[PDB]
Amino acid sequence: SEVAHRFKDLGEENFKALVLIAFAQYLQQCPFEDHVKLVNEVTEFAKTCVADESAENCDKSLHTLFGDKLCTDCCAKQEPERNECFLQHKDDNPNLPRLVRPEVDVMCTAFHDNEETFLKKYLYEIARRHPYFYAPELLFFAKRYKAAFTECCQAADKAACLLPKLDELRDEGKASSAKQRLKCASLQKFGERAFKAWAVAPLSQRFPKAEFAEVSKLVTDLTKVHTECCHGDLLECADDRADLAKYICENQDSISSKLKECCEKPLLEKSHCIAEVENDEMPADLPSLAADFVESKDVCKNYAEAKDVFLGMFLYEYARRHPDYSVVLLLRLAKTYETTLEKCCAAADPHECYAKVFDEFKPLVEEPQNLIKQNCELFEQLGEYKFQNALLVRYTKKVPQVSTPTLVEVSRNLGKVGSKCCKHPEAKRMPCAEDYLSVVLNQLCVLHEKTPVSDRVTKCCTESLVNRRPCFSALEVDETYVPKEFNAETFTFHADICTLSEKERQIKKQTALVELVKHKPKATKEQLKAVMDDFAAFVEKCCKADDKETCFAEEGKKL
Numbered sequence: 001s002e003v004a005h006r007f008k009d010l011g012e013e014n015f016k017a018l019v020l021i022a023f024a025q026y027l028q029q030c031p032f033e034d035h036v037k038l039v040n041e042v043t044e045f046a047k048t049c050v051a052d053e054s055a056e057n058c059d060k061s062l063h064t065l066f067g068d069k070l071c072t073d074c075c076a077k078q079e080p081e082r083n084e085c086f087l088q089h090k091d092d093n094p095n096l097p098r099l100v101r102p103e104v105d106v107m108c109t110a111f112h113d114n115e116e117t118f119l120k121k122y123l124y125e126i127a128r129r130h131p132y133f134y135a136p137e138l139l140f141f142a143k144r145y146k147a148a149f150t151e152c153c154q155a156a157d158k159a160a161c162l163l164p165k166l167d168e169l170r171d172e173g174k175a176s177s178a179k180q181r182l183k184c185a186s187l188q189k190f191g192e193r194a195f196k197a198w199a200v201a202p203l204s205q206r207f208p209k210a211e212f213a214e215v216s217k218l219v220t221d222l223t224k225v226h227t228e229c230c231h232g233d234l235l236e237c238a239d240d241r242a243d244l245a246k247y248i249c250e251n252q253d254s255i256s257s258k259l260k261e262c263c264e265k266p267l268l269e270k271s272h273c274i275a276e277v278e279n280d281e282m283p284a285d286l287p288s289l290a291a292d293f294v295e296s297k298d299v300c301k302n303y304a305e306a307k308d309v310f311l312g313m314f315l316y317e318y319a320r321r322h323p324d325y326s327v328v329l330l331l332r333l334a335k336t337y338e339t340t341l342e343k344c345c346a347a348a349d350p351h352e353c354y355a356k357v358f359d360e361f362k363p364l365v366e367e368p369q370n371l372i373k374q375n376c377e378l379f380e381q382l383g384e385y386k387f388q389n390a391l392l393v394r395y396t397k398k399v400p401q402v403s404t405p406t407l408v409e410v411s412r413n414l415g416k417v418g419s420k421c422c423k424h425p426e427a428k429r430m431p432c433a434e435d436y437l438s439v440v441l442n443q444l445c446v447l448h449e450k451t452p453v454s455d456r457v458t459k460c461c462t463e464s465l466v467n468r469r470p471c472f473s474a475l476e477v478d479e480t481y482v483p484k485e486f487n488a489e490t491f492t493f494h495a496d497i498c499t500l501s502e503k504e505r506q507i508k509k510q511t512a513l514v515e516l517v518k519h520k521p522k523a524t525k526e527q528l529k530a531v532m533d534d535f536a537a538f539v540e541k542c543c544k545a546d547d548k549e550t551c552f553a554e555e556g557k558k559l
């Protein structure tokens, strides 16, 4: 029996959580309760197989069971076409209502009256809005959510204790989903082979002391864990993830020195810990990569006799000695190396041919460095808000076809690069910046993949996972774009508009700035400033009220 094997490893509590998460990811539209009913049934059934390893249907597969319950065009098929149906049906942007939070005491009451249904609510919601969220990590968030309500619903002030923490979680939560969506995307649109090269780079950076073999052993388990979590096998993923966390801690001494504090904590806490670890200290006297990848006369022989490994070795050896490079940059060099050999090992005298392959990297390394240097200066010079507006404008001209809600969303997140990385010294900027920009651009890609409207976005998105940032950065203003004509419906007054927080106002204002640019593509920074300002003064005056709607309607219709 499989269902029992898992229940035994994960425990009862977690098993219920993963099964719940597992259903909410497959059926994002069904109600909370319905799911609960499917979980409890599955939970009991397991308990029998735990007792009777030979009971009825215990020999089944997690996909058939989970599959059957969910069935009580996708179901009218069978394993595994049936499964690949649910996976292919996951919605990255469901039409689900805005998840707002009621009055502090309101929640606090419901948290006490029933603590279990409260959390399952949490997991349900978060899981349905993020059908790719890293299951194991979600358990980590759940426990931190629980801790918040148990310590804040019992103090002098609550909305001063809780809210501040609920903020930091939704934020860290959004980063987690993002980060993971890139992983699932990599595996899917490019295959695991692609995912392995990737994994070899970050790991060789965090664990410079580890031997190449050790790194491969982890990249293999790691590739298996994420394949499962991304494919929908959440139970096995958590089991595998925990086994690996154990492995890492046991061999801790042949991997990284930073794994100490991490390895002395509860399962959930050490997994998250290992996942966020900082780079270990790089070894001192390391031979020059040149010696073995350029000067040796057995390069081509090694490429031929074992390309996949030789390359692995190369990436690992370059990555470990360059913590200051972004993962994507390292893959670009890795690709350049493969192409230069592929060509050179056929030519007359190979050695001469690829003797200058390091020369071909220089260009690829400064392109990233300069951009990060420029937008960081700009960041200090303009502040987060004005900086995003600068991006808003820049990217709206590159891809005007894209929907406004999306351009605002992405651009803001692109803008967050400045404050999230610029405070770091040069050595830590690029890997913080460019790897982050890759996540954000992937959100653009997955959203855009639903209802495509720009072949430029589709090109930059599907042509190469590693070149995405450079590709987008290279785009020139789309001249084939056709000025969007004035609608006005976009500016229909709404009471709330006058009683908005600073964040809300900034969003409303950036939304307007995108519509402006879409309408007048040939506008200049100066005149955009003018139309913005005038209209800004307009909204501020009309809010001073009297009969607002009239003001905004009367004066508005005029504008």
Ligand SMILES: N[C@@H](Cc1cc(I)c(Oc2cc(I)c(O)c(I)c2)c(I)c1)C(=O)O
Pocket: 179, 199, 202, 203, 206, 222, 241, 244, 245, 271, 274, 275, 276, 277, 435
């Ligand atoms: N910027 C990249 C770099 C990075 C990638 C991987 I792959 C990795 O290895 C793990 C190990 C475990 I255990 C996890 O639960 C996870 I998630 C990743 C680590 I450490 C760092 C990222 O963080 O995505």
Ligand SMILES: N[C@@H](Cc1cc(I)c(Oc2cc(I)c(O)c(I)c2)c(I)c1)C(=O)O
Pocket: 371, 372, 374, 375, 376, 378, 390, 391, 394, 414, 437, 472, 473, 474
């Ligand atoms: N006044 C500057 C021009 C400049 C404008 C922007 I807006 C900018 O910020 C980005 C961020 C990303 I991410 C991109 O892909 C791109 I293209 C530009 C940068 I850096 C430089 C100069 O002349 O130096």
Ligand SMILES: N[C@@H](Cc1cc(I)c(Oc2cc(I)c(O)c(I)c2)c(I)c1)C(=O)O
Pocket: 489, 490, 491, 492, 493, 494, 497, 505, 508, 509, 511, 512, 532, 535, 536, 539
């Ligand atoms: N129609 C929306 C409400 C809405 C009204 C306006 I008027 C508006 O336009 C601006 C322009 C600037 I410049 C501002 O600084 C601000 I605040 C609002 C926007 I965007 C949205 C709805 O029905 O939800």
Ligand SMILES: N[C@@H](Cc1cc(I)c(Oc2cc(I)c(O)c(I)c2)c(I)c1)C(=O)O
Pocket: 486, 487, 512, 513, 514, 515, 516, 517, 519, 531, 532, 535, 559
């Ligand atoms: N008078 C023209 C129509 C027109 C109305 C407005 I109001 C306007 O100003 C803005 C300001 C912002 I901010 C926007 O996002 C947008 I879209 C338009 C402009 I320029 C033109 C006609 O009837 O031909």
